[PDB]
Design a protein around this ligand. Structure first.
Ligand SMILES: Nc1ncnc2c1ncn2[C@@H]1O[C@H](COP(=O)(O)OP(=O)(O)OP(=O)(O)O)[C@@H](O)[C@H]1O
Ligand SMILES: [Ca+2]
Ligand SMILES: [Ca+2]
Lengths: 132, 370
């Protein structure tokens, strides 16, 4: 058995940059026009597909965590990454990217510079209060 | 909408609740109490067992037993009781209505995983289930796919190095020194100060002092000397009976045992060494990642000062140029459960569950098939 998902069916099919945002426990595609605009309250999964001369495709998975993102989002970006790697027969290299501490490689995917925006989608984790 | 349950069965505490919640709704002692004085004709209109706090309250008429030893299920008959109580008494759910995720210790024997699968399907009739490794869920809960987890509870300590989502089985370390052993030690060192505590009943009072007043010293020797000088480390504690006691160098001597097991007469190496040792059993090319992503998980990792000592302890053991980092999240007592609550909630997790249909077709062996 493997992991299936509509977005997984689209991942790494050709050279390019694919960006998904974690939205209420799901992997949601980011509009291509909005690439590089990251909500500091959210978590994302980026897949970078490069064409190798040998005809094979190289893969780099980066999960980006905003300073104000909730636990369900940062936890889910990490799991989805593992699952996307597995779906790609574990051929991907995984990178953890933290806001303001991103790697030079990742920063290079964005020619006009990556941009941070306040806000993001709400968490779906139900807050649990300690007994009064 | 169908609601998944998450059950994290520990040597000391059961953490149970619903997928999508940020914390376990039910937290109680993993204990089963049975009548001390039994017989076919002994206690006719009386419960054949109790679980958790109920068992501890009626401790005077009961024989208390822990079905999980050092993170491993050891008493199947008593474990079903725990599970029953979890479903019916604590969660107030009908098991047959909810897909159920359970946790396991790393290196959990194959047959134990099968037994757990069988009981859930055959005795509880769950529509679906899944077993996950405790330490890995903690890593996921900290938003990492690579790091080394130090998981220390009431019965076991493990060092679990994980790379790109998977534990490295060959490099895992288990140490049978944890919370219960620390509670027992603080009992023994308080007797040196005069205080009388030996019974199972008193053990429960010392545990509360262990969780409220103890801490880890950055430098054990200096700490000892600083406690022999003034009395700036001394603290007061109000007994259930109203009496007040004064606690001293025991505050830091008790968790020191984690670093020097010789204190309890154990010949093993401390948790800093087992961490360094687990790391050194990994491929050199991943060590940097490990070293920089030390996640602390579990109750016994809650002592104040624990993260600074380990940070100190491991830089000493590792190459002089190694960037080292300890991550001790405030929620780490529940990290495992929280990891499970997130995993069971994911859109991509639906196909992951083992169905009753799949079990009937394949049997308990299905659990391994991932
Ligand atoms: N605040 C605290 N300070 C120090 N120790 C604590 C604290 N809170 C809990 N503990 C200790 O940690 C234990 C409960 O931890 P935990 O729930 O992670 O483990 P467990 O599931 O029962 O056991 P294991 O995972 O070893 O099988 C007890 O020993 C408890 O006394
Ligand atoms: Ca958010
Ligand atoms: Ca546990």
């Amino acid at each position: 058995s493997v992991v299936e998902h509509p977005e997984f069916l689209k991942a790494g099919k050709e050279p390019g940059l694919q960006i998904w945002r974690v939205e209420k426990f799901d992997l949601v595609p980011v509009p291509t026009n909005l690439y590089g605009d990251f909500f500091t309250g959210d978590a994302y999964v980026i897949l970078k597909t490069v064409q190798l001369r040998n005809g094979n495709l190289q893969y780099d998975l980066h999960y980006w965590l905003g300073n104000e993102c909730s636990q369900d989002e940062s936890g889910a970006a990490a799991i989805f990454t593992v699952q996307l790697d597995d779906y790609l027969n574990g051929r991907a290299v995984q990178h953890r990217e933290v806001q303001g501490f991103e790697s030079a490689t990742f920063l290079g995917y964005f020619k006009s510079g990556l941009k941070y925006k306040k806000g993001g989608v709400a968490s779906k984790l139900r807050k649990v209060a300690e007994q009064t | 909408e169908t609601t998944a349950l998450v059950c994290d069965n520990g040597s000391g505490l059961v953490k149970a609740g619903f997928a999508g919640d940020d914390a376990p709704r039910a937290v109680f002692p993993s204990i089963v109490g049975r009548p001390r004085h039994q017989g076919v004709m002994v206690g006719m209109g009386q419960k054949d067992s109790y679980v958790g706090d109920e068992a501890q309250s009626k401790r005077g008429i009961l024989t208390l037993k822990y079905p999980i030893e050092h993170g491993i299920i050891t008493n199947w008959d008593d474990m079903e009781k725990i599970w029953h109580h979890t479903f019916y008494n604590e969660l107030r759910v009908a098991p047959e209505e909810h897909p159920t995720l359970l946790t396991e210790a790393p290196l959990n024997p194959k047959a134990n995983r099968e037994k757990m699968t069988q009981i859930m399907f055959e005795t509880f009739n769950v529509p679906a289930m899944y077993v996950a490794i405790q330490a890995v869920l903690s890593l996921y809960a900290s938003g990492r796919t690579t790091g080394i987890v130090l998981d220390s509870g009431d019965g076991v300590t493990h060092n679990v190095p994980i790379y790109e989502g998977y534990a490295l089985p060959h490099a895992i370390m288990r140490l049978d020194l944890a919370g219960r052993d620390l509670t027992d030690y603080l009992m023994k060192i308080l007797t040196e100060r005069g205080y009388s505590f030996v019974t199972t009943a008193e053990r429960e009072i010392v545990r509360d002092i262990k969780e409220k007043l103890c801490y880890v010293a950055l430098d054990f020797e200096n700490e000892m000397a600083t406690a022999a000088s003034s009395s700036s480390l001394e603290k007061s504690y109000e007994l259930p009976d109203g009496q007040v006691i004064t606690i001293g160098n025991e505050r830091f001597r008790c968790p020191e045992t984690l670093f020097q097991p010789s204190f309890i007469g154990m010949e093993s190496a401390g948790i800093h060494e087992t961490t360094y040792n687990s790391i050194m059993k990994c491929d050199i090319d991943i060590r940097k990642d490990l070293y920089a992503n030390n996640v602390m998980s579990g109750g016994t990792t809650m002592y104040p000062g624990i993260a600074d000592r380990m940070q100190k302890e491991i830089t000493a053991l590792a190459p002089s140029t190694m960037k080292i980092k300890i991550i001790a999240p405030p929620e780490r007592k529940y990290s495992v459960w929280i990891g499970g609550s997130i995993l069971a909630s994911l859109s991509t997790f639906q196909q992951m569950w083992i169905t009753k249909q799949e079990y009937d077709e394949a049997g308990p062996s299905i659990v391994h098939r991932k």
